[PDB]
Design a protein around this ligand. Sequence first.
Ligand SMILES: Cn1cc(-c2ccccc2OCC2CC2)c2nn(CC3CCN(S(C)(=O)=O)CC3)cc2c1=O
Length: 125
Amino acid sequence: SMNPPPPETSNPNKPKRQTNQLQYLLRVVLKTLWKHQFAWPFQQPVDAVKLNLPDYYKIIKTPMDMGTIKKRLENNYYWNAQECIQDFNTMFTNCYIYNKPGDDIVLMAEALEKLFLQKINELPT
Ligand SMILES: Cn1cc(-c2ccccc2OCC2CC2)c2nn(CC3CCN(S(C)(=O)=O)CC3)cc2c1=O
């Protein structure tokens, strides 16, 4: 269909290894964004079938969403915090390059992104 398979969320052949930055990404960054009143469009992959968005996956090269990021963090999928930060950035980029600038979805992305960037400015060493 219009929708790709969702990104992989677990890695069965990697060690379990935390870093205090990965702990912060889950317990501070993701948890704060997840509970935000504007999170809901970003809590799962964009369902281009159900939302009737035939151009979405033509335009977006790297699908990403916070449900995938949440599962990745819970499964210790990321080897390092920069991989996770990259996924958040991708998610926001996708929204900004696809959607019309004055739309609610973009207003919502911006509020989430400000919060994200403020928490990343406080990323522990
Ligand atoms: C990340 N994302 C999520 C949703 C969405 C995924 C699941 C459920 C709802 C979703 O978007 C709802 C819109 C209200 C925020 C979505 N939907 N669309 C298509 C339209 C919907 C209507 N908006 S608008 C005029 O309201 O800003 C423009 C984009 C693009 C989307 C996107 O980039």
